[PDB]
């Protein structure tokens, strides 16, 4: 079987997984920034 081709695809998944955890991190920071700024502007 095409184990090279399979390792390739598995690697593509691994990359994508790390790309997503990085997206989660930015969105989370975006959210928290907005939470703080909203509170700061309410007083």
């Amino acid at each position: 079987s095409d184990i090279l081709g399979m390792l390739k695809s598995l690697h593509q998944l691994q990359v994508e997984n790390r790309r997503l955890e990085e997206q989660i991190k930015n969105l989370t920071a975006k959210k928290e920034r907005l939470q703080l700024l909203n509170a700061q502007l309410s007083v």
């Binding site: 079987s1 184990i3 399979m6 390792l7 695809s9 598995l10 998944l13 691994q14 994508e16 997984n17 997503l20 955890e21 997206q23 989660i24 969105l27 989370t28 975006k30 959210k31 907005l34 939470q35 909203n38």
Partner: protein, 40 residues
């Protein structure tokens, strides 16, 4: 035994990654919904 055992581990590892990816995509969309709420 030899080849089949290899293949099954690779399959399980791929399924575990797809499962993690799906969980993380949903997480992203849920943060995005929160962000929409904060911007409403």
């Amino acid at each position: 035994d030899w080849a089949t055992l290899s293949l099954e581990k690779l399959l399980k590892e791929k399924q575990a990654l797809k499962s993690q990816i799906s969980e993380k995509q949903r997480h992203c969309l849920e943060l995005q919904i929160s962000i929409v709420e904060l911007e409403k």
